Design an enzyme around this catalytic site. Structure first.
Site, PDB file in Angstrom:
ATOM      1  N   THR A   1       7.842   2.670   8.164  1.00  0.00           N
ATOM      2  CA  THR A   1       8.017   1.418   8.904  1.00  0.00           C
ATOM      3  C   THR A   1       9.238   1.459   9.751  1.00  0.00           C
ATOM      4  O   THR A   1       9.256   0.984  10.891  1.00  0.00           O
ATOM      5  CB  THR A   1       8.183   0.203   7.905  1.00  0.00           C
ATOM      6  OG1 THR A   1       7.621   0.517   6.615  1.00  0.00           O
ATOM      7  CG2 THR A   1       7.303  -0.897   8.350  1.00  0.00           C
ATOM      8  N   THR A   2      10.308   1.982   9.171  1.00  0.00           N
ATOM      9  CA  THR A   2      11.595   2.085   9.881  1.00  0.00           C
ATOM     10  C   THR A   2      11.487   2.985  11.110  1.00  0.00           C
ATOM     11  O   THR A   2      12.220   2.830  12.039  1.00  0.00           O
ATOM     12  CB  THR A   2      12.677   2.607   8.940  1.00  0.00           C
ATOM     13  OG1 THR A   2      12.762   1.765   7.784  1.00  0.00           O
ATOM     14  CG2 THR A   2      14.091   2.548   9.569  1.00  0.00           C
TER      15      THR A   2
ATOM     16  N   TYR B   1      -3.135  -5.656   5.134  1.00  0.00           N
ATOM     17  CA  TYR B   1      -4.020  -6.592   5.821  1.00  0.00           C
ATOM     18  C   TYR B   1      -5.371  -6.859   5.142  1.00  0.00           C
ATOM     19  O   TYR B   1      -5.811  -8.011   5.125  1.00  0.00           O
ATOM     20  CB  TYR B   1      -4.258  -6.143   7.266  1.00  0.00           C
ATOM     21  CG  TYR B   1      -4.973  -7.139   8.174  1.00  0.00           C
ATOM     22  CD1 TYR B   1      -4.525  -8.434   8.330  1.00  0.00           C
ATOM     23  CD2 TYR B   1      -6.093  -6.758   8.890  1.00  0.00           C
ATOM     24  CE1 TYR B   1      -5.197  -9.335   9.143  1.00  0.00           C
ATOM     25  CE2 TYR B   1      -6.761  -7.647   9.697  1.00  0.00           C
ATOM     26  CZ  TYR B   1      -6.310  -8.946   9.814  1.00  0.00           C
ATOM     27  OH  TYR B   1      -6.957  -9.827  10.629  1.00  0.00           O
TER      28      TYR B   1
ATOM     29  N   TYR C   1       3.669   3.754  -1.722  1.00  0.00           N
ATOM     30  CA  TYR C   1       4.676   2.824  -1.179  1.00  0.00           C
ATOM     31  C   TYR C   1       4.172   1.389  -1.301  1.00  0.00           C
ATOM     32  O   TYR C   1       3.179   1.006  -0.681  1.00  0.00           O
ATOM     33  CB  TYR C   1       4.956   3.217   0.237  1.00  0.00           C
ATOM     34  CG  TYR C   1       5.878   2.292   1.053  1.00  0.00           C
ATOM     35  CD1 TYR C   1       6.847   1.499   0.432  1.00  0.00           C
ATOM     36  CD2 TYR C   1       5.784   2.274   2.420  1.00  0.00           C
ATOM     37  CE1 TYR C   1       7.666   0.693   1.180  1.00  0.00           C
ATOM     38  CE2 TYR C   1       6.602   1.471   3.201  1.00  0.00           C
ATOM     39  CZ  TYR C   1       7.532   0.690   2.566  1.00  0.00           C
ATOM     40  OH  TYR C   1       8.363  -0.130   3.261  1.00  0.00           O
TER      41      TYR C   1
ATOM     42  N   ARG D   1       5.140  -7.063   3.371  1.00  0.00           N
ATOM     43  CA  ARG D   1       4.526  -6.557   4.602  1.00  0.00           C
ATOM     44  C   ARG D   1       2.994  -6.384   4.527  1.00  0.00           C
ATOM     45  O   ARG D   1       2.338  -6.548   5.542  1.00  0.00           O
ATOM     46  CB  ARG D   1       5.112  -5.237   5.030  1.00  0.00           C
ATOM     47  CG  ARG D   1       6.553  -5.284   5.446  1.00  0.00           C
ATOM     48  CD  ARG D   1       7.061  -3.929   5.919  1.00  0.00           C
ATOM     49  NE  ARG D   1       8.470  -3.916   6.366  1.00  0.00           N
ATOM     50  CZ  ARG D   1       8.853  -3.971   7.640  1.00  0.00           C
ATOM     51  NH1 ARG D   1       7.941  -4.092   8.557  1.00  0.00           N
ATOM     52  NH2 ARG D   1      10.149  -3.920   7.996  1.00  0.00           N
TER      53      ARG D   1
ATOM     54  N   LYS E   1       7.682   4.496  -4.021  1.00  0.00           N
ATOM     55  CA  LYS E   1       8.736   3.773  -3.350  1.00  0.00           C
ATOM     56  C   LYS E   1       8.462   2.287  -3.622  1.00  0.00           C
ATOM     57  O   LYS E   1       7.469   1.715  -3.136  1.00  0.00           O
ATOM     58  CB  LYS E   1       8.693   4.089  -1.858  1.00  0.00           C
ATOM     59  CG  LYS E   1       9.654   3.218  -1.029  1.00  0.00           C
ATOM     60  CD  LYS E   1       9.644   3.620   0.455  1.00  0.00           C
ATOM     61  CE  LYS E   1      10.598   2.721   1.262  1.00  0.00           C
ATOM     62  NZ  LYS E   1      10.229   2.939   2.664  1.00  0.00           N
TER      63      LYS E   1
ATOM     64  N   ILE F   1      14.740   5.273  -0.974  1.00  0.00           N
ATOM     65  CA  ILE F   1      14.267   5.632   0.346  1.00  0.00           C
ATOM     66  C   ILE F   1      14.810   4.502   1.248  1.00  0.00           C
ATOM     67  O   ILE F   1      14.361   3.348   1.187  1.00  0.00           O
ATOM     68  CB  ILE F   1      12.760   5.828   0.417  1.00  0.00           C
ATOM     69  CG1 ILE F   1      12.364   7.076  -0.408  1.00  0.00           C
ATOM     70  CG2 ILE F   1      12.367   5.971   1.915  1.00  0.00           C
ATOM     71  CD1 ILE F   1      10.836   7.223  -0.670  1.00  0.00           C
TER      72      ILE F   1
END
Ligand SMILES: [Ca+2]
Ligand SMILES: [Ca+2]
Lengths: 295, 295, 295, 295
Positions: free
Chosen positions: A44-45, A107, A133, A138, A162, A207
């Site tokens: 994402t980052t 989603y 993850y 999100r 994560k 992370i």
């Protein structure tokens, strides 16, 4: 096991809306020089939603080239389709990634069984190490600790998780139950401001977003803990708190890119639907970076 | 303005791993026979994340030919990349879709300005009508009523919003502020069990999951309202309550596909990471569908 | 400083709806014999809402009599009126309590300034040590860490806080900011299942419900931490988790009273609006108590 | 049935530390002149936690003599002890109150059966009409619609509910299920900004804070609805929105007392732990009251 300590979820720099590998390479060298133990590319980052397949290949290959096998390169490869996720995983494998980071499908809110089946399908079809993850804020779905433990128990290729659910009950149980299912299963924090407490729970590091700008300090936080110096680890955590908070006053990576720009590493460019940090955020970051000795 | 009343977010039937267009057409005729005012194809109810490019084209093209201009066909086309979204939008436009439903970027949590820029970028580059879709529980972001209203004020091409935030304050304000900025801006519920209240707020109907199985009854709920019969509309709302709740006991469209299968419309087949409904879900549906006269 | 380690929030036993001091005295002796470092009488766990003033006097006086000055006796004395709270505080003082536990006013949701003024008013009018009790899930108001720090800094008589907000961010900041304002300010957990992490944050122990039934084990959890054995402390925490959770499957003290009854200490009687534990809860407690070596 | 339309939860004016009955009577006449259908005295808006026994008696007795049977006077009488509640109820009954508003026990979080037993215990021991008051944000407990309906079915003396849970599903279900169990059971909103939607759900009006300052307008919102003018009622709802929001920017009744003071009705005096409104709150009120024609 991939790594213990700090794995940087590294930004994807852009210039004129294109990948900026010269700035990226400066950033990778900063991570390497400050003792980071892994790089997570295209999480994402790193704006994975807006980096196209040809760009991913270039970025992954270039990261492997700079790192020279010194630390693992773990590639974000999760989507909300099981079929498409496998395709991305097999692409990372073929490029020579050392592992993949695979977010729970976002989603479409799969059931817990759906999540198990998703990771199973992928696990049975790659030789790479896979990191689950979990980031419910999100994705709209939380991996229950019991579901993570079932994955640990059953899928030999899934080597860790994560954990970005910030609830300390979730963190406590994810660590406890997964390691009970498989003693070598890794549990890294997905929130910089939960790393300390996740270490105390018995996890394996972080992370990190913050390590983009303050790699040595995040490394020190873990290193002090691992060395048995709980109170010194906690003090690093406390000193970093303002930076940890500032980097999320707008959605990550909006603040961290503004921070890297202030520091002279990258242009402050994002791809739509992300946009540059507000002046208020920049002003805050400048102050916090200064106070922290980073500017 | 697309439509007032019911727009069915239609499932995408699969059989042995492929599109089942024969069952799809039966379901499309069931909608048309029962007075539905629009079809939304390839929404989340239509398993948009797991339908490939070839299949998207075939499904949209077939729908257009079956419907034969009787009602608008609006195509789900939103992703979390502004670039990619535009491509899907243009593809729908090329096929002859009457509109696109464009969800707010999920997972990457764009700022409000980013949301505005996202829709502006697309709006400026298509002649299709665009419907904003807000569903924070799935996406991780909420379009503020004030942002919706700015969008309504500025972007001629954005014709309405599917409001799936269930908070009645949000429903009240989205309807109020968008219609103040632009009197013909459309506001449709994105939750079946909010339709009645959204009509009472001044809205224009619903983009419905329930109408997959109960098209006449959802039409009636709206028709009664629109004819000035508030209590009759409320009574239909109350009678439908069990079905509305039952269709979300597991993530949509897992229950509705089980329901349609019970009714002999489709095979109860989904794509990973979704999986068929539990025995307990099927039991509930069997009972609720009977009580509702649908089985 | 009152105490470090475990302070038991002791139940108020009833028989035929009357105070049952013979059973109470057995329970106090069990606490004392197992190394508990304080008793909190007439907190939530002791049904303070339903114990009348004459009963409070008898219970407080009897606790002081049994304990013989061996550990402090801290009396719950907070209400949602500042005037009435002072009256209760002065009553506890006159009875010879060693401190008071004063919950943030419940139901009327005072502002942060209101909370400061409430504790200031009381502090300026008693010689007793006062412990702030923050429990937003019950009261409807959360004491912000900064507000607790302001109280620490300014009110010399307020000696600590029982932090029952379960959010680890709240726990981290309450500990950090209060001790920065006054190094000797005490911070005890108000949730048994947060004690471990609150110790790791640098706090002082726990005002416990679980210690009613498992005093030695809760004492060991803190003692191991204080001795530098983080991993042994964490193991106690982990072994106790099932009991910690079971004691809150219904509102406390409904489960803990059913547990004490199974163990032979008290009758399973509560005052309205509290009622005895369901059979499901009792069955769970019996199993968990057995597994834990308490039955 | 008490009333339909608006019941004003009236403030308790203070001046120099004592009841200000002269200002109270001015405010009572303002309500009566403007068509309000009931007064609720000593609710939370009336600072019930900080009004002593002598003052409660005087305030209720004075209200009864001013109102002179024109409308019902309902007295706030609920605490978190079943025993004490009954005493307050009987005291109201002895004075000649027309009813009591009895909040669900706060802070102690009774089970659903406990709630039922609480109201049953009181119901069986008074001849007054009882109104259940659900406000989970203040109390820490939610009366389930199913529990309300059981109460409606069984307890002849409980005549309705003030529903201050703002969730529209709860509003929908409380109205639906209680009226199914007992057709004349009353359901009034406990949030001004839910009145319109609660009327649309089938409810009976509002027990209002806003009507302290805008009695005619809240009456109109209900009157229009009741006369069949849904859109006119919605328009009043929309026009009142700023005032409804402004009166809760700080905990009620801090803003409404500031508002009444601005309007020259009362002294802006509250009892600890409540404190006067901030300058920013007063500024907002001054502006909103002007825009609404009330100043
Ligand atoms: Ca190289
Ligand atoms: Ca003695």
């Amino acid at each position: 096991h991939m790594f213990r300590g700090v794995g940087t979820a590294i930004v994807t720099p852009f210039k004129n809306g294109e990948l900026d590998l010269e700035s990226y390479e400066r950033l990778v060298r900063y991570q390497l020089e400050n003792g980071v133990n892994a790089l997570i590319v295209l999480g994402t980052t790193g704006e994975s939603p807006t980096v196209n397949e040809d760009e991913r290949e270039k970025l992954v290959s270039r990261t492997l080239e700079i790192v020279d096998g010194k630390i693992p390169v773990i590639v974000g490869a999760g989507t909300n389709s099981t079929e498409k996720t496998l395709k991305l995983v097999k692409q990372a494998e073929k490029l020579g990634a050392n592992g993949v980071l695979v977010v729970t499908p976002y989603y479409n809110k799969p059931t817990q069984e759906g999540l198990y089946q998703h990771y199973k399908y992928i696990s049975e079809r790659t030789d790479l190490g896979i990191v689950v993850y979990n980031v419910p804020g999100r994705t709209g779905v939380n991996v229950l600790p019991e579901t993570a433990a079932r994955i640990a128990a059953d899928l030999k290729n899934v080597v860790g998780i994560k954990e970005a659910n910030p609830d300390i009950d979730q963190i406590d149980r994810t660590v406890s139950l997964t390691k009970q299912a498989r003693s070598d299963f890794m549990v890294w924090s997905g929130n910089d401001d939960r790393t300390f407490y996740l270490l105390c729970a018995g996890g394996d590091g972080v992370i990190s977003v913050v390590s983009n700008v303050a790699p040595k300090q995040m490394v020190e936080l873990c290193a002090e803990y691992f060395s048995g110096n709980l109170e010194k680890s906690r003090e690093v955590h406390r000193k970093l708190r303002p930076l940890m908070k500032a980097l999320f006053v707008e959605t990550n990576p909006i603040p961290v890119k503004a921070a890297l720009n202030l520091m002279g590493f990258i242009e402050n460019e994002l791809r739509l639907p992300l946009v540059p940090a507000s002046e208020k955020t920049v002003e805050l970051l400048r102050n916090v970076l200064k106070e922290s000795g980073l500017l």
